[PDB]
Amino acid sequence: VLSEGEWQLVLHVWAKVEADVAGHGQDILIRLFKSHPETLEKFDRFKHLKTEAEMKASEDLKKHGVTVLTALGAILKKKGHHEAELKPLAQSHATKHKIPIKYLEFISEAIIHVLHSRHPGNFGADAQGAMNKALELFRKDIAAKYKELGY
Numbered sequence: 001v002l003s004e005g006e007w008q009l010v011l012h013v014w015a016k017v018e019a020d021v022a023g024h025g026q027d028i029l030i031r032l033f034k035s036h037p038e039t040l041e042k043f044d045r046f047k048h049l050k051t052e053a054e055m056k057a058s059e060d061l062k063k064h065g066v067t068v069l070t071a072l073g074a075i076l077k078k079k080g081h082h083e084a085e086l087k088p089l090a091q092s093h094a095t096k097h098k099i100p101i102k103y104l105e106f107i108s109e110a111i112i113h114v115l116h117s118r119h120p121g122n123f124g125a126d127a128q129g130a131m132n133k134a135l136e137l138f139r140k141d142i143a144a145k146y147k148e149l150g151y
């Protein structure tokens with residue numbers, strides 16, 4: 001469980017991400033897709049994108065970045081009490097999208113790498129630590145739904 005102080009650091013930096021949900025989304029997906037090309041293959045929607053320039057120019061990618069960061073923000077603002085928000089995500093991602101839990105680790109690294117670029121002053125190592133912890137709690141809870149479902 002995160003402390004109240006840890007939550008405040010998390011949600012402080014997230015309030016900032018939300019100045020530009022779309023721009024954050026782009027940076028995060030593109031970092032994921034370049035660092036972990038296997039991830040891009042899970043998306044029939046996006047696997048025609050063969051360069052970073054093409055990814056950056058994709059309005060549909062941008063659109064989907066917002067869908068993702070919107071869901072994550074909702075989850076983070078529950079400060080651990082995210083059961084309702086997490087059940088549908090775990091279901092669709094295990095059984096329909098076929099996403100390994102390992103890939104949640106990779107997007108966690110991407111989120112941290114980007115939150116870093118765009119809000120250094122509000123993402124010192126204390127806030128980085130808190131954000132790590134929050135993303136780890138999320139992954140743990142997803143992992144247990146996965147195990148339930150046989151994935």
Ligand code: HEM
Nearest residue numbers: 039042043045067068071072088089092097099103104107
């Ligand atoms: C922070 C982690 C994540 C969040 C919050 C998230 C959120 C979402 C949401 C809200 C949707 C649409 C609704 C649904 O189908 O359930 C979605 C769809 C999807 N997600 Fe994720 N996701 C996450 C991680 C990942 C990762 C790491 C991958 C792949 C490596 C992935 C692959 C997909 C795919 C393939 C779809 C279907 C998209 C389409 O073609 O339209 N997700 N995600």
Ligand SMILES: O=Nc1ccccc1
Nearest residue numbers: 028029032064068107
């Ligand atoms: O659509 N869900 C995604 C979440 C994170 C990265 C890429 C896609």
